[PDB]
Structures are given as C-alpha cells and as structure tokens.
Design a protein around this nucleic acid. Sequence first.
DNA 1: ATGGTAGGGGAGGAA
DNA 2: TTCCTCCCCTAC
Lengths: 111, 469, 959
Amino acid sequence: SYFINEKLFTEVKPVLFTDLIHHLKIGPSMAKKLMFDYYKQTTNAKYNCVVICCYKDQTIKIIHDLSNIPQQDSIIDCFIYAFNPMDSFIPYYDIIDQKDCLTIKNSYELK
Amino acid sequence: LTKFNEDRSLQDENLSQPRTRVRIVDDNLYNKSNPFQLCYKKRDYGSQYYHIYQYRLKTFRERVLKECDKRWDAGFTLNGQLVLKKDKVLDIQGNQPCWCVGSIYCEMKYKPNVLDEVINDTYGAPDLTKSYTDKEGGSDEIMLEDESGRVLLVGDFIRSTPFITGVVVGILGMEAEAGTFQVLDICYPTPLPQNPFPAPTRGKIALVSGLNLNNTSPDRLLRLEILREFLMGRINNKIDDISLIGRLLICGNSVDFDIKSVNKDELMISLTEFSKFLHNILPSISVDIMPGTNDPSDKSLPQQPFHKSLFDKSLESYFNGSNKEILNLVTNPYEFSYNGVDVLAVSGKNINDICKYVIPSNDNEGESNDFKDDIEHRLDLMECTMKWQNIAPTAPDTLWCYPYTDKDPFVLDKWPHVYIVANQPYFGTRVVEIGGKNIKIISVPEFSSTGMIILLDLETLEAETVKID
Amino acid sequence: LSSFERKKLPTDFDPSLYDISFQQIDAEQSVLNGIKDENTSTVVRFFGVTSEGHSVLCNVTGFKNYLYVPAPNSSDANDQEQINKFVHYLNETFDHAIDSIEVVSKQSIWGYSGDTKLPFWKIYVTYPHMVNKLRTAFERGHLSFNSWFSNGTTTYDNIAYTLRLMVDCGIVGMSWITLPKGKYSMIEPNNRVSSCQLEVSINYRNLIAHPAEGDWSHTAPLRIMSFDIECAGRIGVFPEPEYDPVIQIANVVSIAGAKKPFIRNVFTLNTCSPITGSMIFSHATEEEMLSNWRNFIIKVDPDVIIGYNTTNFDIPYLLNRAKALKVNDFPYFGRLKTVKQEIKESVFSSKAYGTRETKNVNIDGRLQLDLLQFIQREYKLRSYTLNAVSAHFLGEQKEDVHYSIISDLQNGDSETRRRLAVYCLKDAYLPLRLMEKLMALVNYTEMARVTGVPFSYLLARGQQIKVVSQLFRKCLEIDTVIPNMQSQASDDQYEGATVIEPIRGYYDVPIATLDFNSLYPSIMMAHNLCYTTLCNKATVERLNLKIDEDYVITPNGDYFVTTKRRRGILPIILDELISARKRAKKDLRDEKDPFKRDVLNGRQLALKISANSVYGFTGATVGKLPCLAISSSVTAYGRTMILKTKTAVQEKYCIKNGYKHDAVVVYGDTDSVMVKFGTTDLKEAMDLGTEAAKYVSTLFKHPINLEFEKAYFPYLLINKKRYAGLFWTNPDKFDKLDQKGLASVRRDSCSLVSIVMNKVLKKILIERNVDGALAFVRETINDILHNRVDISKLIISKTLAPNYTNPQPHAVLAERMKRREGVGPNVGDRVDYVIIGGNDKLYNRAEDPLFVLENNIQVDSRYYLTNQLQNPIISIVAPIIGDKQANGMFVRSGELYIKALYDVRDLEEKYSRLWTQCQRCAGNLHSEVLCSNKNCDIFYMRVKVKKELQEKVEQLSKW
DNA sequence: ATGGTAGGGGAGGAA
DNA sequence: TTCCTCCCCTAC
Ligand SMILES: Nc1ccn([C@H]2C[C@H](O)[C@@H](COP(=O)(O)OP(=O)(O)OP(=O)(O)O)O2)c(=O)n1
Ligand code: SF4
Ligand SMILES: [Ca+2]
Ligand SMILES: [Ca+2]
Ligand SMILES: [Ca+2]
Ligand SMILES: [Ca+2]
Ligand SMILES: [Ca+2]
C-alpha cells in the first residue's frame, strides 16, 4: 500500500517517483497520485518537495522557483517528482529490473 | 499558490494499461555499405593528403562544367572580350573575362602551424585559437589552387560568400595585376539527385546531442534521467504523443572529461553511468549512438563507431549478434534511412570549423553584410555545405582525416532529405531548396548548455523542440 | 637589352675637360704592350666603377719595384763610379734588368738603436719579378764585387708588387682615385684589352688617391650578380661535369644598396613556360646556353659575382662542363678579353678557421663573395647548408626539391621546366637576400678600407696580411724598412694569461663582472710596446738612458723605451683599429631592429679580432716578423693586472674600510674578475661594481680601462671556463641567459642536450623551482629510453680533419660515405651523424641520419643517455641538490582498451598536422610533395609519426 | 702560406 | 683501473 517508513523516511536515499513503479508495480498515473496524497496528509517530518512541470510547449522544468512563471496558463500537468528530505541533492542510479513497463515495449525481442 | 496547482493537476486516470504498448516500428536501412566506415586494418597511412584534393578536383570539374556550358556559354557576351574560354589556372593573361575551376585555399595568419609550434618547443599546448581569420588586419588571402598554378583572388564577391578552403567552384574574373583575379561570378556544381519518399502510418525521431557526462554533476545526470523518463512517457500523458517516438539518436559528445588531468579515471565512471542510462532506456526505445569529437573514438573525421568493450557488462545482451535494430553504434557522419527518409547526420565538427574560418576572433565595427555573429549564419553555412557538394570542405587542411586514396566519402553523391548537424550552440531549421530539390536542415543543439531534444516527424519533416530543465 | 648594358658614356667626352674619379675594386699586375714608361713596361690595372656607374681600367704605368739592401760597409761604397760599375755587373748577371741604385737614409724596424739612420740602397728593377731573384742572390751571397756582399746580407721590405704600388701611392682597398683632368691618356680602340667603358693609362705620380674618410667615404653603384645552376645527373650518381649536363642557370643581377634586383633570368636547356617577373632565355642545346650565358655576363658587366658554394661547385662545374663540351670560347668572362679562367686548388689552414681546400677561379676585374665562405668565417653554426643558414638568418624553412626528381622534372614538359626554373630563381635570390641582411659588402668594405688589403684578400687570406699592410703603410710614413727574416721553423709556446682558480658553486648573491676594454691592445698602446721601441741592456748602457723616464723593464724582463724617446708604430695601428671599433659600436648603441643588432655586433667583433691579431702577429713564430718579446711581454702585464685587481678589490671593499661585507673574487679569465660584493641587492651590487671599475682604472696607465661589464644575480660556476647565470645590465630586468662553454653552446653535442640544458637552467635560475626542473629531467630520460626523441635532436656534428691517428666516428663515417655514394665530405666540412646501436667499437658505429631514416636502424639510446646527456645535466644540477640525488636521477581489457585508443588519438592528430604542413609549405596542394630539406624540424619527424601510427593502428585492430 | 695561449672533456690504450 | 696521449671546441 503505502509502506511509508522505508519508502520515505528511512529511505534515506532520495526517493524517485519511478521507484514506486519499480517496487509497488504501480503505474505512473497512479504513482504521482500516491506521492500526492502522501505529501498532502501522511507527512509528519521535514521533507523536501521537488515537482516537475510540463507545459503546452512541452517544456519540462523542475526548479519551479517556488513562486511562479507563466503558469497563469499553459500548464498541462504538474506531477510531484522525487522527494529529498535529506535536502541536499544528487541521487544515484543503476541497472533496474525490467518487465514492469506499462509505458511501451520498444519494438523487438532482445534475442 | 504551489499546493493548489498540484491539487488541480491531480490527474488520477489510474489504468494507463497493464498491457504495455508498442512503439511504431521505424527501422534503419539494414547494414549494406557505409561510405564512412573503415576497419582499423586496411588503413594505409602511407599515402599523402593529396589524393583527396586530386579526387575532389577531378570529380568537381565535371559538376562545374555541366553548369558552365550553359551559363557563361561559349557564346556568352560579357561586356567585352567575351569569356574567351576555359584554361589552366596559370595559363591566363590579359584583362579579358575568363573562367576556370580550382580548389580554393585560404591562407590566414592565425591558422595554427605545427612547424612553428615545434620550432618554438611549444607543441602540445592548449589549442584554444577561437578563430582563424584576421579581420582587424585584412591579411587573409584566398588563393585558387589548381593542378599547376596558384592564383590569388581579390574583389567584392569574396566579401559576400564564405569561400572556404578545399571547395571546388568555378570562378570568373579579370586578371588585374598579373597575379590576382577580380572575381565576377561563381559557379556552384550541378544539382545532385535525391531519393523519392512516399507520402504515407506515422513516425518520429528523438534527436539529442552533447550529453557530456562526467564526475561533476551540475544537473547533467539529472537532466539525462529526466530525458529518459520523458521518453518513457512517464512525465506526460502516456501515449499518442510519446508512444510513437520510435528511435533516439545521440549525436556525439556523450562523455566529456578532462584528458589533460584525470588520467583515464572518470572516463570509466562516465561510461558506467552512460551504460546505466542505456540499460534503463533500451527496453523502451531503440538507440543509435554516434561518436562525437570528445568521445572514445578516433580524432580523424570518419570516426569509427564505439567499441563493445567501452560498455558495461549489463548491455552485453544488446551487443549480441542480430540485434542492430535495438542498438546501432554508427560511424560519425552517417547516412541513416528511417522509413525511407534519408537523414544524414554529423557530430557537428565540420560546421564548427567552417565558422572558425569565417567568424572573427576577439577583435580586441559591426558588419551586416558579413560578420556572422551566430544566429542564422550557421544555417547559411550548412546551406553552402549542401551547395558545395562535400559535407566537410576543409577536411584535410583543418579537421584532420584519413588520407584517402581514389575516393573521398565527404563529397556527396545524392542529397538527403534531412541533414542533421550536431553540437551546434543554437537550435535552428531551414527547408532549403536548391536545384529543384529541397532538403531539411536541422541543427540540433547541445543537451548540456541547453535542454532541447528535437522530435523530427518522418511524414511532414516538420521537427519540433521540447526543452528539458 | 636596354637595361643590361651600363649607362652610356657622355657624348662630349675627351681626355681633357674631364676628371675620371672612380672606386677601385680590383687590381692585378700586367704588362702593357707599348712604349715603356720610366724604363719599365709593367703596369698595375685598377678595375673599378665611377660614381655614375661607368667601368674603368686605369693602367698605372711607370712604377718600378725596388729592393732594399744596407749600404756595404767599405770605403769605395761612397764612390759613384763604384756604384755604376756595380749596377753594370748586375746587368751582366741578371739580364740587363737592374735600373739604378739610389742611396736613401732609412732605419730598420728592429729595435731602438738610436736616432741615426743608416744608408740603404734602393735597387730598382725593370720588371718586378726580378726582385725575387735579386733578393735570393743577395741573401745567399752569390754576388761577388769588391767583397761587398760576398758574405751575405739581409734584405728588406719583402712585399708583393701590387701591394707595393698600393702602399706607396696611398691606395687602401676599395677606395677612390681621381685621375686629374688631362693627365691621363686613353687606350685607342685598337689596343683595348678589356670590356670596360673607360680604359685609360696614367703615370703613378699623377693620380690622386684619396683616403677613405670624409667626402670620399661613399660607395659606387656596384652591380652584384647572384646566380646558381642545377644539373640533371644520372640516377644515384652525383653530378659529374664530364657526363651530367647543366640544364638551368638562374641570375639575379642587382645594384648594391637597392631594395630589389633589376634583372632576373633563367637560362634553360629546353622550352620553359613563362614566369611572371623574370625573363626566360630558353635555348636548344647546352653549348648555346653556355655561350649565351657568357655573353650575358659580358654585357651586364657585374662587379661582384656572389653565390652560395659557387667557388667550390658552381663555377668549377660550369668550366669543366664547357671544357667537356668543346666550348672553347666560354671560359673567357672576366673584365679582360683574352685571359682564360682556370681553376687553381689552394688550401688555407689556420687555428681560428681550420683547414679547408678551395678551388679559386681567376675572374679578372670582378670581385667574388661566395656566401658560404663568408658565413664559414663570420658565424659558428651546426651546419652551413643553404637550407640551414636560410632557416637560421632569414627564418624561413622552404621546400628543397628532391635530387633524383630533377631528371624527371627536366625530361617532363614545359610546366615541369617552369617548376625547375622557379626552384632555381629561389636558389639564386637566396644569396642576394643573405648578402643584404648580413651586410657583407658594407662590413668588408670597412675592413678593406681600415686595414688596407684589397677586398680579394679578406676572404682568401688570414689576419697576417692585414697586419703586414698596416705595418708597411706606417713604416713608409716614418722612413723605416721591414727586415726579411727567414722563419724560425718552430718553438713550443710562450706564457699565456692567468685563469683565476674558481670558487665553484651556485651563488644567489649578485655577481658583478669587471673587465678591461681591449686589454692587450690597451697594454701595447699604454706601455709603448712595439718593434721600433724594443731595446736591450747594452743599448741602455751605451746611450745612457734613465729608468722609468726613457725606458721600462717589462715583467718579462724585456726592455722598451718610453714615448719620450720613440713612438712605436704598433700603438698607432692599434689606435686606428680600436678607434674604428668605437665608431662601429656607436651604431648598435643607436640601433632598434633586434636582428640588426646581431649584425652590427658582428662588425664590432671583427674589429676586435683584428686588433688582437696585431698581438698575435708578434706572437706567431711561423710567419714573418715574429718578436716573442712584445708578445710574451703582454701576457705578462696581463697576468699582473688580474693579480693586482684581485688584490685591490679584495682588500679595499672590506669591513675595515667601512663596508658591509668582504668582497670575494670568485673567478676571472684573463681580464675579468667576477667579484661577489656580499650584498643581496642588485641595484647595490651594480652600484658597487661601477664604483670599483672607476677606482681600479685609477691604478693603471691610460688608456687601460676597467669598466663594469655586467652582473649575474643567479650565478652557476661549474668549472674553469664553464659557467652560467642571468645577464643583468639594469637592475629591473634581466637581458638573457648566458652559458659560457657548457655542453649546450658546444657544437659537438646533439641538440637534445642543448634543449634540455636550456630548459633546466631556465627553470632553476629564472623560475627558481628546482623540483620542476628535476621532473623534466626524469621525463626526458624516459623519452630517450623509449625511443621518443626525434633524430633531428640526436644529430651530432664534428669538423673533419686532414689526417687522423686515433680513428674517430665521423672520420670513419666520412670514409664510408665516400665509398657508398661515390662522394663524401671533404676536409673542413662538418659531418653529421647519429650513433646507431651495436657491439663493435664506437668509431665503427656512427651513421648518416638520412641512412637511419631510410633503413630504420635503431638509434643507440643507452649511449646518448650515458655519454651525451648525463654528465652535462649532472654537472649543472649537482651544485644545487648535491651530488647524490643527481647521480641517482640517472641510474581489465576495458581500461587497457582506453589506452592504445587515446594514444592513436594523439598520433593521428600529429600525423595529419605534419603531413598537411608539408603541403602548406610546398604550396602544392594537388600533387606529391617530395622534400629533402633535411635541416627542417618536421623532417625525420613525419616519417617517425607515420611509422608509429601505422603500427599503433595495426595493434589497435586486434581489440 | 697559417694571429696567440689556457683548458675542459670525451675515447681509448697501455701498464 | 689510472694516467696519458689525440681530438674537438670554446673562452679569453
Ligand atoms: N680572439 C681573441 C680574443 C681575446 N684575446 C686576448 C686579447 C684580449 O685583450 C684579451 C681579452 O680577451 P676578450 O675576449 O675580453 O677581448 P677584449 O676584452 O680585448 O675586447 P672587449 O674588452 O672590448 O670586450 O684576450 C686574443 O688574443 N684573441
Ligand atoms: S619537410 Fe615539410 S616543413 Fe620541412 S621543408 Fe619539406 S615541406 Fe617544408
Ligand atoms: Ca644550386
Ligand atoms: Ca674585456
Ligand atoms: Ca671578458
Ligand atoms: Ca666591456
Ligand atoms: Ca685537462
């Protein structure tokens, strides 16, 4: 469900919203919602929020300046990206187990 | 109010599928013959850098003459002493009009000279030398070499067009001071054929260049990961706009490191990170990696593809035989054929060096007819490089090459519909048309300084950009 | 062709109303068919050119060569009838040749015997060659007449006829002569013997010979003709005149002191396409080519046929070729119509110039200034090939066409022949540019005007002839004769000067340097040393001279008389020669161009070898007038001046006298004293050196002068006559880095050592980081051991010698080259070689670089590291770090694939740069570039990088 | 015919 | 293995 001790707090490495897809097998259009409700209510301790912003012209920016840019229109979606309560920066990535993809299967078999 | 816009952007579709979708299959032309491909064996470095020039002249003489028979024709009546005729560049005298063909060769003072560096014991220094031309000195000379002769050129035209070395275009002028020309008209070679592409069920291509990964992480790795996530459709609505992107094309400068200091340490961690990204992205998109100038590949321009050894063990399943459709690893200037749309791509060094010729250096005044600053002049340089049939004019002279013998791959044989040049500082596109044939010149920008990745449609050829930050 | 022939003579020209005034460039003895003037028929022909550009052939008629003998000591010697019977007897014996015997009162040049003048007999002869026979007869004693000269006598004033006329009339070489209006006669067109425009004849009493100072110091419009030839030789065999033709002959005739030549030609053997700016006389056969070239020279009438290696190769080749082609009228192209040019091989040996065999050709009336000889005399360089001297002086390395491709270029078509023609034009315009830059004519004109020898002696004979000429002129001024002394076959040596023991070490204190201006000349002028001031103890007792007032006893015990008694002539000669050096140094003081200040520095450094050679004259046992009592008496007086300076500065600038530190003279070589004042400041060390120069010069007699020369803030005194430091003249910026003797300024050390030592010294002395210096040293030792130094940096050069006892590497190499190619280096040519690897002895193991670059033989690296680079570097780094460290200095698949791929990425970026710089150099973008300018940096490098890139790519193929 | 002497340093050969 | 001639070159 929402195993939020080792998913956020003791998750001390910054937790990406794709880790939800890879672990809980949840979908992106649902993992964003899980992160959403989490930071809305479940939060109890200090946690830094990082949010992506995609516009009509397809611009993808994350710094989001905490105040605004022409958001008064042109914003298609605004998904809550990774959290970093450790607050510094710089996650690290690696090989990831596939076969959990609802995005798209490329075209071909790996042979 | 940041929280309320989040609340509004609550999308909660919640299916999107289990049911992974499939990208639209756009397949490169199966490996038949790549003119830019040289195995490391059979490279005979014995010959000199003169078979290249001889072949260029020998092949462009016909291309220029097929146009010069009609324009400047044998009965052309220029003001007086009509055109008298062709000649051999040295066999010219008098003030009568005349026209010959020759491989222009510039002579600038700031073009770095290796003999001077050796005699000054300063060989091996940083080669910053931002530009070659001497604008504030006017000392730049533009000769017209041929088989036997070297005629200096002066006039007004050499202030209009670039006139880059190595190119072979027939000139027409009046001998002024027994050594120079007074250029009057320039003949570019005959138009070159294209391939026909049928109008019809979709297609796109994600172009990206200048990744420049290293140990330092000023958002570079994070921008790359956001890129793969957006290419996964995980950043936007799932399909119908990202489901069909088809293929990625990394266009060089993927791994940037300091050769001068690191001693090959970071050049491995960068490659491991790059292989992590490739393993994360390959089950979803096919990828074609193309070596740049700052990459584990040759410095000679026909750079051969990346080696399988550079990549992590994780990707070994991809490097198995009969899997070129997933990962490609092509030579640097490559002639793809994606669903019939012949797209020719470069790492972007040729245009960089051409601009080094034309653009001035630190001057220490503003010209509109000249003084290419950097906005559209780069697209004009690519236009010329599609007029001048070869795609690397100053090849042996300033952007070094394997000293070919009896063949030069750079001189074009047929125009491609698309001509992508990489690592350009600015993004631009022009649907140029010359000789009844039209091509599309896309100029992909760097993915390090900027965030743009171009999405080129393969049925309307109207590329669009998407900026990542 | 309306520009060739000189300015036409004025129409209204007659022997009256005009004063032919011209500059004489040449002079040679000849006989003049016609009436004997003043009982003699021989004449001296003064070729020259007047101010407007007309040629001249003034024949100076009427001079009779004379021989001086002391009047025999007898009673009848004062009887006129006896003298007349004597000249009668001589005419009986010596072919009616002796004219008369004048009685003149002269004195000898040897010693101050008093103010009384002996009576001498001036024996005139009709033709000047008779004086040699007469002198031999007088010296042996064959004359038998009243027991006068039966024992034997010593003759006087032994000098050639031409120089005798030039001395008596007062004509220095390259000076101005004015034939007065109406005093001269013109040779009628029937009896003309030359091609010159004005061919006159004057009596020697009439002509006015101006001194070369004042209004008569300018120079006439000479016509310098440079040229060059190229021969089409058989394959693999050097061009031999008997079988290999001359195919082209360039020409760059020009006027002296002009910006650009006014003639260019190329006489080709076949048809040649036109070149812009240069006529092309294309002939059909070689005989016609040679004859037309001769006619061309005769029509142009150049004055100075300059070239590069023309004396040894070009002109002899042309002459032997014309001889082999039965062209009989070719070899007559001097200013005289019917004198054949012939080759006379002569050898010149000297300590300062070395043995070298030359093939002199007698082009009568025209100077010759083969630039090879001029440079081999004036400049010390590693090699003297045209490429290398052009790269050194002009600063340009240009293509040098391959030898074997000359035959193909010739037998191709008119375009290839135009290519040959432009090559020849470059080769022929090179010597003229060199002559204009180096200022050959101007310097040699000053030398021939100051000394007195003709211009032809400056490049064909040593310094003794200059001293002889100046001596004879001064003696003639002062009524003196020079006794003919048979050479004292040899000696061992006399005493030299003192080289103070060095306090070796590395000094961070400033090191002042106090030296004397022209030491030995100043001593000679100061203490009146001369031949005519020499004296002995008996003479002092006879004449009753007083000490320190009329004579001085030199620290060698020899006596000389003060200027109150006599004024020696060597003071006067030296005065002129070091007062001309002052006005040659008053020019580079006012010179801005940096390359002009190392040519105006080669003019003050040639009038200081010419003043220190007046001493060497007195010191040379072999060679006339050797007096080892003026020459071993300046070395003393030079050994008691450093011994007095090193004792005065060391004991004045001490703590007792109110100073901060005790001064210490750490070194000093024959005049200098590298005093270390003890202060760290540099503006104070210079301020003390300047004060010391004044105080010490106060102790000696005028003109002896000690001046503060330079300073060295960092100083590295390796050994005796070897050191290095920074050259400071003003206390705010250093001028350069001096290396006095170290293996970097030697020329028998590979260029690698020079470069390494210069960089090491630069770091240690200027940059002051010793650790960075050592790191570079270790970096080089790896390069040598891994074969990463280019052959251009491993070439050693030594001067071949005439004969050897202990075999030398370059000597065996020269023999082997002669055996391989058919021609090898001659005596006096520097031989270039690198030491290949092997087991047999060193001398058997040395090869021509072009043989190493054509057979890939392995350059011995252990030898270079151990012998060449080790000891110099150790010697210069041991003072800083101590000897121990110095000697110590010389005693998975992925990461593997990143290597051999960032190595090829460094070789294929140098390969292209080099093999496209060759194209930018030859200018030939479209055809093959075959270069053989083996004195080019990139030479030996392009092939190495190619052989390395091929191998590295072959190796990278495997992965 | 040919200016001088002092002196370092390399190669090698004999005792 | 230590002097002791040649031999080249330079410094003054
Ligand atoms: N080619 C030479 C150089 C020098 N000396 C002798 C005579 C000098 O008087 C003395 C001094 O040597 P220098 O090199 O210092 O020459 P000078 O000091 O005489 O000239 P200057 O002081 O003007 O530099 O050495 C010589 O006999 N032959
Ligand atoms: S080798 Fe190259 S750089 Fe050297 S002279 Fe020849 S062309 Fe010039
Ligand atoms: Ca020549
Ligand atoms: Ca001195
Ligand atoms: Ca001195
Ligand atoms: Ca001085
Ligand atoms: Ca010694």
